[PDB]
Amino acid sequence: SGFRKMAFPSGKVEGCMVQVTCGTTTLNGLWLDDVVYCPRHVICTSEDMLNPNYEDLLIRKSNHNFLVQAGNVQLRVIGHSMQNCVLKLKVDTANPKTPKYKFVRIQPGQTFSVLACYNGSPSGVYQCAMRPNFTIKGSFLNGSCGSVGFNIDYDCVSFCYMHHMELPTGVHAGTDLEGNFYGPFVDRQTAQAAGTDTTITVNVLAWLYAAVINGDRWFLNRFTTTLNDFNLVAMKYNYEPLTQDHVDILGPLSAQTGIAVLDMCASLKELLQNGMNGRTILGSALLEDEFTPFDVVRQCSGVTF
Amino acid sequence: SGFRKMAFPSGKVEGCMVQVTCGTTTLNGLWLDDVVYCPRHVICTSEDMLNPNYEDLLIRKSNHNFLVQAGNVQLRVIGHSMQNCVLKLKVDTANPKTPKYKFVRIQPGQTFSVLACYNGSPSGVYQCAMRPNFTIKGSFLNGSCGSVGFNIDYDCVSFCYMHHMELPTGVHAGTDLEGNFYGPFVDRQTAQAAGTDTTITVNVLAWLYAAVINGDRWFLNRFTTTLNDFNLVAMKYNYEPLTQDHVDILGPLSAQTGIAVLDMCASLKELLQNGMNGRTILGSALLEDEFTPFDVVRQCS
Ligand SMILES: CO[C@@H](C(=O)Nc1cncc2ccccc12)c1ccc(Cl)c(Cl)c1
Ligand SMILES: CO[C@@H](C(=O)Nc1cncc2ccccc12)c1ccc(Cl)c(Cl)c1
């Protein structure tokens, strides 16, 4: 019993966190094998960031300009290259703590654990979702750039995010590990705004299934709906469209709880039109959308890593 | 900016998680140096649960009855002793991944990270508070016994909890690492019930300060209150009494935000009477009580 916002164990990622210092800037780097990945804005000062030519700024840097520190051991940089918005600092020493890993680009709605670091030192781990507007609602302070978002698949760390910046609303923007930003964001000091967000419909339904599994059934009703009728209501309440893929992915939960996906959709349709009526679902007065259908299964099944 | 329920990195604790098997029971053990700590009820059978005599059951045990597994390496048990409700299995190999650690007993309201494990394998990490009723609102399935609660302040892991049982309401009861249960709980199948839970008032105020720091100010008001008047109101909403210690602890946040503790108390009093009016505080429609004043200051560093 119990449902918590649960992150993947961060041990495999902690062994990769290093501190990258370039001039006045100090941020975090991900050390995998003999390469240290970090945001490319580390090479920039407050002057460069306004309109930065990163190719030109990098050509002026030498390997000794980058100070990489793994614990209290200074790593020597023997190369530097750039892949999109990530800087790849080739180092002489391969990280012995390098886990089995992949670089994966995630889609909006997909969740991941964030290992927040400051000065190459992990300070906290939290679970969050890639918003449909491509921002994350993280918890980050200055110096957390280079902090990574990840999932664990069996014994393989899939790195899916690297924190670059904080938008004026307090939401965060970053890239996948290939340096490609999530969303219409750029690593330059300019007017950037996160788009109007939407609710991750499949994740709300996944969390409603997790509430049923936990004994919270008040929101259930005798009704079912067409996927088209549900999507009309969802569109109106700033909810993401629920595709047939989402209905299929919610299948095992529908089987476990005995409530069809379109049946649970009718419960959500009612909750949107009438509210919670002072009641809570899993100790929450709002519909939670940061648990994917897989996260609910993993938590209510106890999958280990 | 941003406020999240944030757990401590679990790496230091993952390197200590082992699987402890005694007969039919398989739960988790914490391997620190040459000792494996796990709930003593691993030695319990079906009948020896309503009224077990743990001293007598453990005297019938030999070191080869306990099968400790660290990864795919079977650890050899060379001793076994009991300290309250924890079983201490002395092993022949000291854990090379053993971090700097302390055993600390926490008080209600105190928060900690929980590394949920099954079969000695960490599966997830989440944040908890020790409820005023001495239970935790965890997320645990069968086989999670021996999972630990911890805080990691400066290089050192302070172990404060070991999961022992799930109560009939779905809340969890466990012990500190010295085997002493939190609350009036026992490791017997006797009829046990968690007492009526209350809201951690100091933690709600700490989180209201975190909202002010983040730019949420709608709930603030021109009012202040006496500590006595605040407690009389809050106790009617099933809130913990706010002591002078809590007012002192909230001092740095009061200084940082410029809102006196008794002033923020009146904000909380208003929230209790009015509700949120369809508004949220830090993306939440309920008053959050699992963030201590120390958590807020650390997360808003
Ligand atoms: C200051 O360096 C970056 C930044 O915003 N860092 C942060 C990242 N996350 C949270 C922060 C909270 C407070 C303050 C700074 C935070 C930054 C600034 C502008 C641009 Cl265009 C880019 Cl790519 C990077
Ligand atoms: C059944 O074994 C224990 C237990 O509660 N395990 C669990 C621990 N946590 C969550 C569970 C969820 C579902 C089912 C079992 C869960 C147990 C039972 C009674 C006593 Cl008195 C003790 Cl000390 C231990």
XYZ file of C-alpha atoms and ligand atoms in Angstrom:
654
model
C 0.000 0.000 0.000
C 0.804 3.671 -0.406
C 1.638 5.698 -3.460
C 4.591 8.000 -3.518
C 6.418 10.084 -6.102
C 9.251 7.618 -6.481
C 12.509 8.191 -8.276
C 14.830 5.467 -9.601
C 17.783 4.703 -7.259
C 20.462 7.305 -8.186
C 23.587 5.265 -7.340
C 24.555 4.486 -10.937
C 24.314 8.219 -11.870
C 26.071 9.578 -8.732
C 29.228 7.676 -9.782
C 29.239 9.803 -12.995
C 28.766 13.283 -11.514
C 31.826 15.493 -11.881
C 32.420 19.262 -11.523
C 33.277 21.204 -14.697
C 34.916 24.604 -14.269
C 35.624 26.878 -17.244
C 36.927 30.281 -16.195
C 34.396 31.816 -13.804
C 31.632 29.240 -14.456
C 31.344 26.039 -12.395
C 28.610 23.538 -13.293
C 28.106 19.725 -13.358
C 29.325 17.223 -15.891
C 28.299 13.648 -16.611
C 31.403 11.407 -16.846
C 30.723 8.293 -18.945
C 33.731 6.221 -20.092
C 36.459 8.762 -21.178
C 34.013 11.602 -21.993
C 32.539 14.323 -19.766
C 29.266 15.785 -21.025
C 28.100 19.175 -19.738
C 26.074 22.195 -21.089
C 28.052 24.215 -23.671
C 27.101 27.520 -21.931
C 29.956 26.770 -19.407
C 32.425 28.285 -21.981
C 30.369 31.546 -21.975
C 30.653 34.486 -19.604
C 27.711 36.937 -18.878
C 28.956 38.934 -21.969
C 29.013 35.956 -24.420
C 25.532 34.545 -23.483
C 23.655 37.494 -25.162
C 24.620 36.377 -28.724
C 27.063 33.433 -28.499
C 29.005 31.863 -31.376
C 29.794 28.627 -29.561
C 31.998 27.278 -32.425
C 34.194 30.398 -32.143
C 34.167 30.484 -28.338
C 35.244 26.801 -28.198
C 38.044 27.279 -30.770
C 39.629 29.849 -28.338
C 39.563 27.291 -25.473
C 42.380 24.863 -24.786
C 42.067 21.586 -22.851
C 43.674 23.152 -19.771
C 40.936 25.866 -19.647
C 38.463 23.137 -18.522
C 39.004 21.970 -14.950
C 37.182 18.667 -14.457
C 37.048 17.319 -10.907
C 35.794 13.843 -9.930
C 35.636 13.882 -6.132
C 38.973 15.381 -5.103
C 40.762 14.021 -8.230
C 41.406 16.454 -11.074
C 40.735 14.748 -14.423
C 42.927 15.860 -17.339
C 41.052 16.921 -20.436
C 42.728 15.662 -23.620
C 40.029 16.809 -26.094
C 36.925 18.953 -26.498
C 34.147 18.839 -29.046
C 30.535 20.035 -29.252
C 27.416 18.130 -30.148
C 24.515 20.562 -30.402
C 24.121 22.244 -26.929
C 26.371 19.735 -25.073
C 30.130 20.038 -24.648
C 32.097 16.752 -24.795
C 35.311 16.919 -22.829
C 37.447 13.909 -23.672
C 39.422 12.937 -20.547
C 42.445 10.613 -20.124
C 40.760 8.460 -17.455
C 37.728 6.265 -18.148
C 35.202 6.387 -15.273
C 35.472 3.060 -13.468
C 31.965 3.571 -12.066
C 30.522 3.841 -15.638
C 27.215 1.980 -15.648
C 25.496 0.240 -18.583
C 23.891 3.253 -20.298
C 22.058 4.642 -23.328
C 21.196 8.137 -24.456
C 17.448 8.269 -25.093
C 15.267 11.192 -26.110
C 11.947 11.092 -24.269
C 8.515 12.382 -25.298
C 6.230 14.787 -23.360
C 4.455 12.910 -20.586
C 7.408 10.589 -20.033
C 8.780 10.754 -16.494
C 12.343 10.525 -15.231
C 14.416 10.911 -12.114
C 16.549 14.031 -11.742
C 19.772 13.867 -9.805
C 20.250 17.504 -8.784
C 23.956 18.319 -8.322
C 25.982 21.367 -7.308
C 29.769 21.397 -7.827
C 29.705 17.797 -9.126
C 28.093 16.608 -5.897
C 24.650 14.970 -5.910
C 22.410 16.719 -3.390
C 18.937 15.357 -4.150
C 16.889 13.092 -6.375
C 13.329 13.723 -7.496
C 10.873 12.362 -9.995
C 9.388 14.623 -12.613
C 7.742 14.558 -16.023
C 8.618 16.109 -19.335
C 5.719 18.553 -19.664
C 3.711 18.641 -22.909
C 5.187 22.204 -23.295
C 8.716 20.607 -23.100
C 9.736 22.135 -19.813
C 10.252 20.330 -16.533
C 8.867 21.652 -13.256
C 12.144 20.987 -11.483
C 13.718 22.258 -8.303
C 16.983 23.812 -9.263
C 19.249 26.562 -7.925
C 22.267 28.269 -9.598
C 25.031 25.744 -10.278
C 22.670 22.823 -11.014
C 23.341 23.086 -14.842
C 24.635 19.769 -16.063
C 22.360 17.839 -13.614
C 20.882 14.852 -15.425
C 17.475 13.248 -15.840
C 17.393 9.475 -16.217
C 15.410 6.253 -16.109
C 16.669 2.761 -15.334
C 15.709 -0.095 -17.609
C 16.673 -3.372 -15.971
C 20.373 -2.512 -15.170
C 20.807 0.195 -17.872
C 20.692 3.904 -17.133
C 18.903 5.704 -19.967
C 20.055 9.306 -19.772
C 17.315 11.505 -21.148
C 17.962 15.011 -19.827
C 20.631 17.563 -18.962
C 19.599 20.808 -17.236
C 20.653 23.964 -19.045
C 18.484 26.822 -17.786
C 15.553 28.240 -15.795
C 12.786 30.120 -17.634
C 11.223 33.329 -16.147
C 8.296 31.333 -14.668
C 10.570 29.102 -12.592
C 10.169 26.090 -14.925
C 13.252 24.443 -16.414
C 14.533 23.786 -19.890
C 17.254 21.378 -20.917
C 18.494 18.997 -23.604
C 18.706 15.248 -24.257
C 22.289 13.863 -23.935
C 22.899 14.560 -27.666
C 22.570 18.326 -26.879
C 19.174 18.733 -28.557
C 16.914 20.885 -26.401
C 13.461 19.744 -25.393
C 11.118 22.376 -26.725
C 11.600 25.602 -28.616
C 14.391 26.731 -26.308
C 17.880 28.147 -27.081
C 20.953 28.393 -24.782
C 21.215 32.140 -25.173
C 20.115 35.036 -22.943
C 16.971 36.246 -24.760
C 13.178 36.495 -24.141
C 12.075 32.859 -23.846
C 8.702 31.734 -22.580
C 7.324 28.292 -21.832
C 4.160 27.632 -23.837
C 0.756 27.165 -22.121
C 0.995 23.760 -20.528
C -1.503 20.904 -20.741
C -2.240 17.960 -18.420
C -0.806 14.548 -19.297
C -4.117 12.685 -19.697
C -2.633 9.150 -19.916
C -0.671 9.790 -16.718
C -3.770 11.074 -14.853
C -5.575 7.846 -15.867
C -2.537 5.775 -14.794
C -2.648 7.507 -11.364
C -6.429 6.929 -11.116
C -5.657 3.193 -11.612
C -3.012 3.456 -8.854
C -5.725 4.967 -6.586
C -8.099 2.049 -7.337
C -5.274 -0.427 -6.535
C -4.816 1.443 -3.225
C -8.542 1.285 -2.328
C -9.602 4.814 -3.409
C -12.811 4.087 -5.464
C -15.160 7.036 -4.839
C -14.446 8.594 -8.229
C -15.451 5.454 -10.155
C -18.848 5.398 -11.834
C -21.076 3.153 -13.930
C -20.321 5.086 -17.129
C -18.109 4.601 -20.170
C -17.346 6.980 -23.067
C -16.162 6.992 -26.678
C -12.493 8.026 -27.117
C -13.726 10.864 -29.411
C -16.246 12.129 -26.749
C -13.582 11.883 -24.074
C -11.096 13.857 -26.241
C -13.663 16.632 -26.839
C -14.018 17.066 -23.067
C -10.233 16.718 -22.526
C -9.440 19.380 -25.172
C -11.794 21.790 -23.351
C -10.048 21.271 -19.974
C -6.462 21.713 -21.299
C -5.792 18.012 -21.283
C -3.629 16.159 -23.790
C -5.472 14.030 -26.373
C -5.641 10.376 -25.367
C -4.560 8.244 -28.339
C -5.305 4.539 -28.947
C -1.622 3.917 -27.889
C -2.488 5.310 -24.434
C -5.565 3.081 -24.211
C -3.379 0.042 -25.095
C -0.587 1.026 -22.647
C -3.252 1.368 -19.885
C -4.427 -2.205 -20.733
C -2.641 -4.138 -17.930
C -3.963 -1.660 -15.297
C -7.469 -1.938 -16.819
C -7.140 -5.741 -16.526
C -5.736 -5.605 -12.923
C -8.412 -3.229 -11.623
C -11.332 -4.452 -13.759
C -12.150 -0.923 -14.979
C -11.962 -0.413 -18.794
C -9.888 2.585 -20.031
C -12.952 4.331 -21.514
C -14.762 3.532 -18.236
C -11.951 5.299 -16.243
C -12.148 8.110 -18.878
C -15.780 8.704 -17.862
C -14.613 9.010 -14.215
C -11.976 11.547 -15.272
C -14.571 13.365 -17.463
C -16.770 13.709 -14.338
C -13.885 14.865 -12.128
C -13.076 17.571 -14.718
C -16.686 18.823 -14.962
C -17.545 18.596 -11.233
C -14.265 18.517 -9.296
C -13.286 16.490 -6.252
C -16.150 17.812 -4.028
C -13.725 18.274 -1.111
C -12.480 14.695 -1.459
C -8.917 13.492 -2.189
C -7.389 10.800 -4.398
C -4.131 9.369 -2.986
C -3.942 12.244 -0.459
C -4.175 14.789 -3.267
C -6.904 17.351 -4.118
C -5.610 17.749 -7.708
C -5.386 15.135 -10.449
C -1.731 14.065 -10.591
C -0.168 13.713 -14.067
C 3.490 12.816 -13.331
C 3.119 9.006 -13.057
C 3.153 7.143 -16.353
C 1.194 3.885 -16.793
C 4.571 2.083 -16.447
C 5.492 3.986 -13.238
C 2.234 2.841 -11.639
C 2.906 -0.774 -12.677
C 6.568 -0.658 -11.476
C 5.466 0.783 -8.081
C 2.395 -1.464 -7.545
C 4.477 -4.529 -8.717
C 7.888 -3.743 -7.076
C 10.271 -3.958 -10.087
C 13.921 -3.732 -8.828
C 17.182 -2.166 -10.156
C 13.389 28.183 -8.141
C 10.854 25.356 -7.980
C 9.876 23.213 -5.042
C 9.803 19.471 -5.229
C 9.506 16.545 -2.843
C 13.179 15.695 -3.000
C 14.878 12.606 -1.630
C 18.593 12.381 -0.767
C 20.714 10.582 -3.418
C 20.447 6.851 -2.556
C 23.840 5.647 -3.851
C 25.465 5.346 -0.420
C 22.514 3.206 0.837
C 22.173 1.030 -2.317
C 25.703 -0.280 -1.727
C 24.491 -1.633 1.652
C 21.309 -3.426 0.527
C 21.519 -7.195 0.840
C 18.910 -9.991 0.797
C 18.340 -11.897 4.060
C 16.665 -15.302 3.838
C 15.704 -17.313 6.929
C 13.715 -20.424 6.052
C 10.640 -19.345 4.075
C 11.053 -15.591 4.767
C 13.106 -13.375 2.438
C 13.479 -9.674 3.304
C 16.143 -6.914 3.018
C 19.153 -6.345 5.206
C 21.396 -3.329 5.674
C 25.067 -4.359 5.427
C 27.342 -1.914 7.268
C 30.952 -3.002 7.925
C 30.788 -6.726 9.010
C 27.186 -6.563 10.321
C 23.880 -7.087 8.507
C 20.894 -5.456 10.176
C 17.385 -6.629 9.318
C 13.962 -6.921 11.103
C 14.079 -9.675 13.697
C 10.737 -11.066 12.409
C 12.668 -12.710 9.516
C 13.182 -15.585 12.066
C 9.376 -15.844 12.524
C 7.236 -18.612 11.097
C 3.359 -18.694 10.669
C 2.404 -19.603 14.311
C 5.252 -17.662 15.952
C 3.759 -14.339 14.946
C 0.743 -13.676 17.195
C 2.940 -14.191 20.274
C 6.566 -14.848 19.314
C 9.347 -15.294 21.844
C 12.161 -13.868 19.758
C 14.863 -14.689 22.337
C 13.813 -18.367 22.255
C 13.410 -18.508 18.438
C 16.900 -16.978 17.890
C 18.490 -19.417 20.389
C 17.229 -22.267 18.077
C 18.949 -20.602 15.099
C 22.360 -21.357 13.736
C 24.498 -19.123 11.507
C 23.829 -21.385 8.491
C 20.044 -20.865 8.857
C 20.523 -17.215 7.656
C 21.310 -16.871 3.961
C 22.684 -13.392 3.262
C 23.179 -12.429 -0.389
C 24.997 -9.282 -1.576
C 24.451 -9.151 -5.330
C 25.204 -12.690 -6.481
C 27.723 -13.282 -3.639
C 26.551 -15.313 -0.651
C 27.897 -13.743 2.569
C 28.879 -16.115 5.378
C 27.164 -15.418 8.710
C 29.596 -15.934 11.607
C 27.376 -14.528 14.394
C 23.853 -13.451 15.269
C 22.604 -11.229 18.045
C 19.444 -9.223 18.692
C 19.097 -5.625 19.683
C 15.445 -4.884 20.412
C 13.498 -5.616 17.136
C 16.564 -5.767 14.874
C 18.566 -8.881 14.171
C 22.343 -8.301 13.772
C 23.952 -10.899 11.564
C 27.718 -10.707 11.921
C 29.265 -11.642 8.563
C 32.814 -12.647 7.546
C 33.161 -9.895 4.927
C 33.116 -6.151 5.650
C 31.105 -4.221 3.044
C 33.623 -2.328 0.912
C 30.880 0.091 -0.140
C 30.116 0.980 3.582
C 29.763 4.763 3.822
C 30.330 7.201 6.723
C 27.211 6.519 8.795
C 25.376 7.117 12.070
C 22.279 5.589 13.615
C 19.943 8.454 14.568
C 16.457 8.231 16.108
C 14.181 10.909 14.645
C 11.124 12.701 16.117
C 7.611 13.030 14.574
C 7.622 15.621 11.833
C 11.167 14.698 10.781
C 11.570 13.744 7.151
C 13.775 11.127 5.511
C 14.383 9.318 2.233
C 13.248 5.728 1.911
C 15.122 3.312 -0.313
C 12.452 0.704 -1.080
C 14.039 -2.718 -1.765
C 12.785 -6.184 -2.648
C 15.145 -9.185 -2.437
C 18.081 -6.921 -1.505
C 17.584 -4.880 -4.687
C 16.755 -1.162 -4.561
C 13.679 -0.442 -6.673
C 12.813 3.154 -5.756
C 13.577 6.115 -3.541
C 11.005 8.493 -2.077
C 10.591 11.114 0.661
C 8.673 10.465 3.915
C 7.921 12.181 7.139
C 7.634 10.417 10.475
C 3.960 11.114 11.227
C 2.958 12.570 14.616
C 1.235 9.139 15.187
C 4.679 7.442 14.594
C 3.775 5.751 11.352
C 5.071 6.550 7.874
C 2.842 6.877 4.822
C 5.163 4.782 2.708
C 4.732 2.847 -0.512
C 5.637 -0.685 0.305
C 4.687 -4.167 -0.909
C 5.423 -7.593 0.639
C 9.170 -8.215 0.836
C 9.988 -4.560 1.513
C 10.837 -5.383 5.168
C 14.341 -4.230 6.014
C 14.115 -1.230 3.592
C 15.721 1.762 5.280
C 14.893 5.418 5.872
C 17.837 7.818 5.903
C 19.110 11.369 5.675
C 22.455 12.274 4.063
C 23.863 15.381 5.599
C 27.485 16.092 4.524
C 29.099 12.812 3.305
C 27.446 10.818 6.142
C 24.325 8.682 6.009
C 22.192 8.916 9.128
C 20.053 5.800 9.188
C 16.828 6.547 11.005
C 14.362 3.870 9.967
C 13.962 0.218 9.056
C 10.625 -0.868 7.635
C 9.018 -3.615 9.745
C 5.261 -3.835 9.112
C 2.204 -2.489 7.334
C -0.743 -1.573 9.587
C -4.380 -2.340 8.518
C -4.864 1.221 7.186
C -1.978 0.899 4.713
C 0.398 3.052 6.804
C 3.774 1.637 7.881
C 5.486 1.020 11.168
C 9.117 0.398 11.765
C 12.045 0.986 14.051
C 15.220 3.051 14.314
C 18.471 1.131 13.532
C 18.811 0.159 17.234
C 15.598 -1.943 16.847
C 13.404 0.435 18.874
C 10.043 0.872 17.188
C 8.626 4.291 16.443
C 5.289 4.430 18.178
C 3.357 1.959 20.293
C 3.978 -0.840 17.809
C 5.275 -4.333 18.321
C 6.510 -6.941 15.851
C 3.593 -9.334 16.659
C 0.402 -10.008 14.659
C -1.614 -8.592 17.611
C -4.421 -6.143 16.791
C -2.578 -2.884 16.279
C -3.926 0.408 15.089
C -2.248 3.665 14.142
C -3.537 6.531 16.297
C -5.548 9.394 14.709
C -3.072 11.317 12.588
C -2.415 15.046 12.802
C -0.823 17.592 10.462
C 2.783 18.635 11.152
C 2.094 22.341 11.767
C 5.767 23.428 11.797
C 6.309 21.707 8.432
C 3.217 23.367 6.887
C 4.593 26.765 8.005
C 8.053 25.836 6.641
C 6.410 25.015 3.263
C 4.412 28.281 3.326
C 7.794 30.073 3.696
C 9.103 28.024 0.718
C 6.075 29.258 -1.278
C 6.817 32.916 -0.380
C 10.469 32.414 -1.448
C 9.129 30.992 -4.747
C 6.804 33.978 -5.360
C 3.506 32.579 -4.075
C 2.086 35.301 -1.827
C -1.716 35.120 -2.255
C -2.241 33.341 1.048
C -0.401 36.065 3.049
C -2.449 38.467 5.237
C -2.197 41.682 7.341
C -2.785 39.624 10.493
C -0.660 38.204 13.287
C -1.747 35.941 16.172
C -0.742 34.871 19.669
C 0.855 31.381 19.760
C -1.915 30.286 22.183
C -4.697 31.621 19.852
C -3.039 29.914 16.892
C -2.858 26.539 18.690
C -6.499 26.692 19.772
C -7.542 27.221 16.104
C -5.112 24.700 14.556
C -5.984 21.936 17.070
C -9.584 22.123 15.763
C -8.271 21.236 12.267
C -6.249 18.251 13.639
C -2.999 20.158 13.554
C -0.071 19.602 15.870
C 0.476 22.249 18.568
C 3.183 24.700 17.517
C 5.683 25.011 20.368
C 8.155 27.861 21.014
C 10.854 25.475 19.609
C 9.003 25.506 16.258
C 8.776 29.308 16.307
C 12.559 29.485 16.933
C 13.306 26.914 14.228
C 11.230 28.937 11.748
C 13.339 32.019 12.630
C 15.765 32.000 9.648
C 12.842 31.622 7.175
C 10.969 34.426 8.970
C 14.121 36.574 8.581
C 14.652 35.596 4.878
C 11.042 36.268 3.838
C 10.332 39.172 6.219
C 7.114 37.532 7.526
C 7.082 36.872 11.328
C 6.208 33.308 12.468
C 3.002 34.446 14.205
C 2.216 36.488 11.070
C 2.568 33.315 8.878
C 0.484 31.499 11.574
C -2.377 33.876 10.844
C -1.926 33.056 7.091
C -2.254 29.349 7.952
C -5.284 30.121 10.173
C -6.922 31.852 7.189
C -6.102 28.936 4.829
C -7.656 26.552 7.367
C -10.909 28.497 7.530
C -11.224 29.412 3.857
C -9.507 26.640 2.032
C -7.573 27.423 -1.146
C -10.484 28.830 -3.192
C -9.382 26.893 -6.285
C -5.833 28.245 -5.944
C -2.620 26.263 -5.416
C 0.489 26.761 -3.307
C 3.604 25.287 -4.957
C 1.441 23.310 -7.433
C -0.521 21.768 -4.572
C -4.187 22.152 -3.541
C -3.492 20.804 -0.023
C -1.225 22.202 2.687
C 1.955 20.095 2.533
C 3.431 18.916 5.858
C 6.331 16.650 4.776
C 8.944 19.424 4.360
C 10.742 20.422 7.522
C 12.150 23.944 8.104
C 15.626 22.390 7.490
C 14.387 20.859 4.133
C 13.085 24.234 2.967
C 16.287 26.123 3.802
C 18.356 23.356 2.082
C 16.174 23.187 -1.049
C 16.079 27.058 -1.312
C 19.947 27.290 -0.609
C 22.982 31.276 -14.917
O 23.228 30.230 -15.856
C 22.044 29.643 -16.379
C 20.839 29.493 -15.443
O 19.790 30.085 -15.681
N 20.996 28.619 -14.421
C 19.999 28.068 -13.596
C 19.440 26.808 -13.795
N 18.478 26.263 -13.039
C 18.018 26.978 -12.024
C 18.475 28.276 -11.695
C 17.953 29.032 -10.614
C 18.439 30.278 -10.339
C 19.449 30.830 -11.116
C 19.971 30.141 -12.172
C 19.503 28.841 -12.500
C 21.648 30.144 -17.749
C 21.105 31.412 -17.927
C 20.681 31.836 -19.172
C 20.805 30.993 -20.264
Cl 20.327 31.562 -21.832
C 21.349 29.729 -20.100
Cl 21.484 28.640 -21.439
C 21.775 29.309 -18.853
C 3.462 -9.897 6.245
O 4.794 -9.646 6.711
C 4.952 -8.373 7.329
C 4.364 -7.172 6.584
O 3.536 -6.439 7.128
N 4.880 -6.946 5.358
C 4.693 -5.813 4.555
C 5.422 -4.638 4.710
N 5.176 -3.497 4.054
C 4.177 -3.493 3.184
C 3.356 -4.610 2.906
C 2.278 -4.575 1.988
C 1.493 -5.674 1.797
C 1.742 -6.849 2.490
C 2.777 -6.929 3.377
C 3.620 -5.813 3.615
C 4.609 -8.344 8.799
C 3.334 -8.667 9.245
C 3.016 -8.612 10.588
C 3.974 -8.227 11.504
Cl 3.552 -8.167 13.183
C 5.247 -7.880 11.071
Cl 6.414 -7.224 12.174
C 5.567 -7.957 9.729
